[PDB]
Amino acid sequence: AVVKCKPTSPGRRHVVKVVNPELHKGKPFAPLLEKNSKSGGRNNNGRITTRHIGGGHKQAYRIVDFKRNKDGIPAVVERLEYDPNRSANIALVLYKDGERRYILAPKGLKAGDQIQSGVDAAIKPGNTLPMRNIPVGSTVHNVEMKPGKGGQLARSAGTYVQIVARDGAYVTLRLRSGEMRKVEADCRATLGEVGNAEHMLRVLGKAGAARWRGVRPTVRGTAMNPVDHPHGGGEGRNFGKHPVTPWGVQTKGKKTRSNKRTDKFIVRRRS
Amino acid sequence: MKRTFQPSVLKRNRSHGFRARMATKNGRQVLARRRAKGRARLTVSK
RNA sequence: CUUUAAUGUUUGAUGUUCUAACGUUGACCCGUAAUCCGGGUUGCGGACAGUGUCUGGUGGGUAGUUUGACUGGGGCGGUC
RNA sequence: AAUUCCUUGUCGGGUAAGUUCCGACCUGCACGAAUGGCGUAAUGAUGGCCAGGCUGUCUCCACCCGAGACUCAGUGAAAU
RNA sequence: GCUCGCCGGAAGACCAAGGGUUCCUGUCCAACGUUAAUCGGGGCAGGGUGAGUCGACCCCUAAGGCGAGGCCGAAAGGCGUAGUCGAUGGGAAACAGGUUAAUAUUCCUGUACUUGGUGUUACUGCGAAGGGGGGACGGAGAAGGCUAUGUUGGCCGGGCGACGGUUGUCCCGGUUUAAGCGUGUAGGCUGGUUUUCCAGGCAAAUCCGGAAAAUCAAGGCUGAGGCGUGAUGACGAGGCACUACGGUGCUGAAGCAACAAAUGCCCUGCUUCCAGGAAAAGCCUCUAAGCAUCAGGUAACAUCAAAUCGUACCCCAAACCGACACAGGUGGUCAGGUAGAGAAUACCAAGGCGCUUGAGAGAACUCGGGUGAAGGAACUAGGCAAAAUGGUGCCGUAACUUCGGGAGAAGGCACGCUGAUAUGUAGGUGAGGUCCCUCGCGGAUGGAGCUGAAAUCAGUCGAAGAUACCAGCUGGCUGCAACUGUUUAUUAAAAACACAGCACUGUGCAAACACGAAAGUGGACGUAUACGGUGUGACGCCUGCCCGGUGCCGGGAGGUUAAU
RNA sequence: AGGACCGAACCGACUAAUGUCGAAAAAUUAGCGGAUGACUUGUGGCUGGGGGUGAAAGGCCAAUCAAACCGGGAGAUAGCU
């Protein structure tokens, strides 16, 4: 659900919250928890590689099952939890053999629902099936690029990929970016669309939301000195230069895709 | 006013101790130069 | 010799297919109480990608430099 | 106009007196629409002006309370 | 020794970090103390630091370091696995009184507790770098039960007192007692007992998890405080006897009740919020390998050991960092009485100090203030500085507005003391007696007793009763910026930077991008509702024309075009 | 519930005055803004010089920063004093 807080004060005036009533109001499943130490944009060398990262509320990583190797084992959805690491919400799944795991929550899943992985699966949301078994023209999420990888496509909230064609051993998938990609049929995929489709409605209200979400202030090039940024300099907000990255690479409409390895799997580009 | 030097024996030993100096050859070269100069206090220690 | 034609030959540019080089930050087993690494099987690409020398283009991102002289406040204007 | 050389542009308000300020016109040297234009409640140790109380800021300074200044005893520098 | 003054949320007492004998005694003013000095944190000599229960040490570990093999790199070396370090964290145990000139939670007196070895006795399956539970956790907020603590009353010992009265509802001081042990309550959490089965817990499992049942409906875990013992013990006001006259020995009465009450415990609790809130070890349990007449474990008893290191002193300062015996800086703990909402402010208890130059005079002038005739900003770039309001309760509160705000708008009236309402009310707490009890730390009545606001009337003193400190000046027009916030430590705090939002662009995941000769990393153990770059900066109208020049994208007709 | 309001500790330095061979190599007095968060602080580490960090000022990097400090080239050169 989407709610707008009354403008009791600045900072609350523009706050729009995304409240999910059915989420579990309790501690997560400890056995599946793992520590997640923040990096603040640093690397092994210790220097800042990616900027605007640092701080934020502590969060513990959840071991989410992606490969879904429990083939032919029906399972029940115990409940839904909010995973800080992912933009969507995770679902606790208890299998008939007596073990609990975490999966990505599709749109149509709720508490007490039945799911099952493996080739012998139905077309109901939450089931896992290779594209060969999945009928053409269907929407799937958490698709694999290679067998056993785990799943890499359509993992955000409210995302999905459409199965378009079937080129024998290969299948054509249209992604949310308009990309037409070719993927081996042996790879696995999950039916249905990811839940929490209202992720865009949140506006974070104020600076503090982004500050404690893990994003630090961003400084524009015009405000920087010539020694640091290619932009900047001159009295009175003078630019007189084409847009460029801080490192001299011309941005604002320059393609950086130079691989020549996976292009054989690329049918069309964005438009 | 909190001046530049705020003593802390643990930090002193872990930053300029003999073990730290020998950890890297550069510190070993520093120790060799100190010995050649013949200073009574080779490094900082209790 | 100018002009042509089947056969066998040197072959190059391009296209399709295969794997035995190569890639695997895909899966399984071992060294191994091991997300490193190496080895064995398999799957997926595959003579592509990537690397080494030469070479055309871009390249103030970076590095070394220059920006003459006469010239009565300055530069401009003018002369060598 | 945070932009205007001429300029204190012209007109009305505010003071008796207003190169500042507000409102109206545009003769825009040299505003202008995401290096944003137009309004915007609330916010500001933000710029400017005005009005009420207040008072030593001032007309115009006067006295008093404490430490220096001054005298004595002991210690005793500096720039040049 | 007696007066006067200061701190007393500190200018008191403990520590952590940091110093290294500055701590006490004897002895001296050669040098130091911004003067003298017999004095000192100064010179010489002596003494002083006692730990199974404090901490370090030690088991484990976060960030992070090192890193056997391994990858890469001209060499050096860089990354990193297994492993090992790394407290700023998790793990076992003590309190009261007494003593030295200097040590005490270490020494002495009393009562306890914890971990292992050895031996005896009765049973039994033991057994892990392996599995499961626990350890194990955020922000904000309300109540309840308590306690440290403080007030009053009764009791005890003394006093009745130099300027009026004080045998009386009067004054002075005490009324303290720990850890541990047993009861286990207030409160919080959770449904238990038994049987059968399961490809799950990288092999197994009686252990965890899951699936079926029969039975009861209670059980189990945690849990402050209070109560008895600890304790017919220590301590205890005061008195008595000697004093190297500083001081030492003996004795020693009562040691209870009510109220208020914490930021401290129940509370790692309970209720909500999204920003979703460390890891491992100790601890309980299950089994693999191997042995089960063994070994090993359990329960009771006796004994041994718990080593080594710091223990002085300062620790908001004269001893630490500032070159100084420097108006500066320094983390945590306890932090009381009256007024006060308050850890503010005014005076004090405990406790600590008068800050290491003073003695005179009371010129101009300087520094910090007090007052002021009349005008009240006329001074000045500028209401700069100064002056002024300032608190509680009640009425009332404009334009605009995003309907929240503006607003504590602006602007008006009462605050002292005493008696009555009410020989202190409402309210809070709550004795004894009476009745029940699923019988004890149990439930009703009841108000004894204690505490106790706010309001009305009347009277009364003062020029002024928020009487001291504390404690917004107010309104309008207006440019900037949405706002909170951050910046040039050490002349610029702003219209500058940043901000939530918006738009373009790049990236298909061995992603783009950046650090790196390369490995490998952050991005991300994330993934097109995801991440990087660019420009503007909430919200409403929106964001008009131009592709010539320079970038970017696509094209290949035709000319040029290196290496070869 | 509030990157809410008034206001102690805590943080910072917006105004005035004193101090410039000062108590202090940016200090003291009264006002001053935040004071539940984009807050602050204790401890231990990581980011090392044409490099780090930087809510961005050419700011900070041990009282020194438009390129720190230490030793060497080095008795650099100086048509200059």
Author numbering:
A (entry chain C): 1 to 271
B (entry chain 2): 1 to 46
Question: Which passages does the manuscript contain on this structure?
Answer:
The proline-rich antimicrobial designer peptide Api137 inhibits protein expression in bacteria by binding simultaneously to the ribosomal polypeptide exit tunnel and the release factor (RF), depleting the cellular RF pool and leading to ribosomal arrest at stop codons. Separation of cellular extracts derived from cells exposed to Api137 in a sucrose gradient reveals elevated levels of partially assembled and not fully matured precursors of the 50S subunit (pre-50S). High-resolution structures obtained by cryogenic electron microscopy demonstrate that a large proportion of pre-50S states are missing up to five proteins (uL22, bL32, uL29, bL23, and uL16) and have misfolded helices in 23S rRNA domain IV. These data suggest a second mechanism for Api137, wherein it disrupts 50S subunit assembly by inducing the formation of misfolded precursor particles potentially incapable of evolving into active ribosomes, suggesting a bactericidal mechanism.
Analysis of the Api137 dataset revealed additional structural states. These include states that correspond to the canonical route (states 10, 11, 12 and 14) plus two almost mature intermediates (states 13 and 15), mature 50S, and an intermediate with density for the assembly factor YjgA (state 9). In contrast, Api137-treated E. coli cells accumulated structurally defined pre-50S particles lacking density for the ribosomal proteins uL22, uL29, or uL16, suggesting a specific and direct effect on early and late stages of large subunit assembly. As all proteins of the S10 operon, including S3 and uS17, except uL22, uL16, and uL29, were incorporated into all 50S, 30S, and precursor states, this strongly suggests that Api137 directly interferes with ribosomal assembly rather than attenuating the expression of some ribosomal proteins.
